[PDB]
Each structure stands twice: as structure tokens, then as C-alpha cells.
């Protein structure tokens, strides 16, 4: 299950590339065992040992020794060292920078009524990001017997989920972000204001930090789940705590 | 998590310790890379003992 042959929907299988490289190594291996069972001529077992050296080689790292054995489509197979290496290996792609739950993005806009410890954040994104909190709050106040009942309650968007969102939102920082995150002030945690619409209103004194025009620049709102991370977003990362550039 | 192995019929040189720019099998044997590959491609013999 780290080199899967998962069937994508449609009866088509979607194998990895390591299945190809192992399949080739094991074929040439089994064939060499046979060529030694038949007591073969020397040149044939030498050829088979060379082919096996190539196959184990193209498995451990392909494109290193001589030319790359090409995949089925027309392309070099991504052998193991290509799993790890590069901008897209495990090290930089899946291990240093992970995708993240509790997060979203939409267009940013102005909203100058704001105090600069808050960011206008839409009702719909906020009710989407804060569903664990809402479910716990609803079954805590007893408005929903089971967790599934709370689920359908917030999906129907009744008049109590918006009250519960306004209450599990209240003193809870979120972490706005802009795409090229050059310096450490391009992640600052705000306190959400629930706002109609679908644009994350961002305070106007904050654009110098984030470096934001308001002509389409999207922003990502992550969430501090735990209690220590709410405290670090409030004390350390808040928007009223870095009003001096660390440079 | 369970891994598996393959019993190679013949031995087989791990490429990283043979082709990494300073060749580890190379400088361990104090032997140039070209001669090691001439042995590995089944071109030329090599003496031992």
C-alpha cells in the first residue's frame, strides 16, 4: 500500500511505477534462475546477469546508470530515488510542507470598519471550518441528541447553528495567509468576524505586511485547533503583536 | 508496513555505492570506476587471490 494498484473509477486500474520496476526485476531474476537450471551457454547467463544488474539498477535509481528504462506511456519510470529526491520527493513535498485540514481560501477584500485585531471571515467558510466545534457545542447544549443529528442540523443551516457559530467563534484566532509567504509577518492570526459574503475582508493597515492588492489575491485561513495553539495565535502571532518588522 | 524481499539469483551491485560521484566501491578498493564497470558488465575479468 505504498506502491498501490488502486482501481480508479471506471474499471481502469491505476498502478504505481514501482510495480513495473519490481515486476521487471523479478522476471529477469526468475529467468536467470531458469537459465542456470538448463545449464545454459555462458553468453546467455552473462547476458541475463547483465540484464538483471540493469533491472535492479533501474529500480534502485533510474536514469543514473546509462539511459532510463522508459515507462509504458513514454516516459522514465519514477524509481525509488526519484521517490525521495527533488522538489517533489517525500522530503520537500509530503514531509516538510503538508496539505492541511481546517483550512480554506477565498478572495480578500477591504472592510475598513475592522479593528486591526480582526478579519472579516465569511459565515459559510466559518461554518465549514468549525464543524467539530459546532457538533460538540450542539450536543453539549442538548439541541441535538446524537452527533448525526447535530450533523444534519448544521447541514440544514437552522437558526441555531448560526447562534452556535457566533458563540464557538468568539475568542478564537484564525491564521490568515497569503500565497508567497516571504517574511514571518505574512502569517498573522486574527479574530474572526462572521460576515455575509464569500470574501475574507482583510484590514487595510495589514496589506503592507501581507503585501496585498485587493484585485484578486486569495488568502488561506487555517485554524488553531487546540488550546495551546489558540494561545500562541493570540499572544505570539496576533495582528496587534507584530507591528514592527523583525528585519 | 510488512515488507518483503527477493532472493536475487546472482549478486548485484547497489548503484548508489557504485555511481555516486566519488564511487564508494571504487575508492574502497582503490580501483578506478572504469575498471569496476568493465568487471560489472562482464567485459573483463578481475584477479582475486
Amino acid at each position: 500500500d505504498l506502491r498501490p494498484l488502486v482501481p480508479l473509477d471506471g474499471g481502469r486500474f491505476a498502478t504505481s511505477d514501482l510495480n513495473d520496476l519490481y515486476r521487471r526485476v523479478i522476471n529477469r531474476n526468475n529467468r536467470l534462475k531458469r537459465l542456470l537450471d538448463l545449464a545454459a551457454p555462458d553468453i546467455i547467463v552473462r547476458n541475463e546477469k547483465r540484464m538483471l544488474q540493469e533491472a535492479v539498477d533501474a529500480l534502485l535509481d533510474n536514469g543514473r546508470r546509462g539511459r532510463a528504462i522508459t515507462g509504458s506511456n513514454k516516459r522514465p519510470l519514477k524509481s525509488l530515488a526519484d521517490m525521495i529526491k527533488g522538489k517533489q520527493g517525500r522530503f520537500r513535498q509530503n514531509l516538510l510542507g503538508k496539505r492541511v485540514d481546517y483550512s480554506g481560501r477565498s478572495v480578500i477584500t477591504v472592510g475598513p470598519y475592522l479593528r486591526l485585531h480582526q478579519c472579516g471571515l465569511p459565515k459559510k467558510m466559518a461554518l465549514e471550518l468549525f464543524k467539530p466545534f459546532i457538533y460538540g457545542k450542539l450536543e453539549l447544549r442538548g439541541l441535538a441528541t446524537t452527533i448525526k443529528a447535530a450533523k444534519k442540523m448544521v447541514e440544514r443551516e437552522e437558526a441555531v447553528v448560526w447562534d452556535i457559530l457566533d458563540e464557538v467563534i468568539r475568542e478564537h484566532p484564525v491564521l490568515l495567509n497569503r500565497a508567497p509567504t516571504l517574511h514571518r509577518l505574512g502569517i498573522q492570526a486574527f479574530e474572526p468576524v462572521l460576515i455575509e459574503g464569500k470574501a475574507i475582508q482583510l484590514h487595510p493597515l495589514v496589506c503592507a505586511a501581507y503585501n496585498a492588492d485587493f484585485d484578486g489575491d486569495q488568502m488561506a485561513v487555517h485554524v488553531p485547533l487546540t488550546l495551546e495553539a489558540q494561545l500562541e495565535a493570540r499572544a505570539l502571532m496576533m495582528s496587534t503583536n507584530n507591528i514592527l518588522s523583525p528585519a | 508496513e510488512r515488507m518483503g524481499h527477493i532472493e536475487l539469483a546472482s549478486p548485484t551491485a547497489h548503484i548508489w555505492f557504485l555511481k555516486s560521484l566519488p564511487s564508494r566501491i571504487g575508492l574502497l578498493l582503490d580501483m578506478p570506476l572504469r575498471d569496476i564497470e568493465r568487471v560489472l558488465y562482464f567485459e573483463s575479468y578481475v584477479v582475486i587471490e
Binding site: 547483465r50 539511459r67 | 568493465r38 573483463s44
Partner: peptide, 11 residues
């Protein structure tokens, strides 16, 4: 003429 090639087919 031994070396100068990393192709198995030629070999």
C-alpha cells in the same frame, strides 16, 4: 573497444 558504452544491447 571494451568500454565507451553503457548499453546492454550492444554488449
Amino acid at each position: 573497444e571494451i568500454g565507451r558504452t553503457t548499453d546492454p544491447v550492444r554488449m
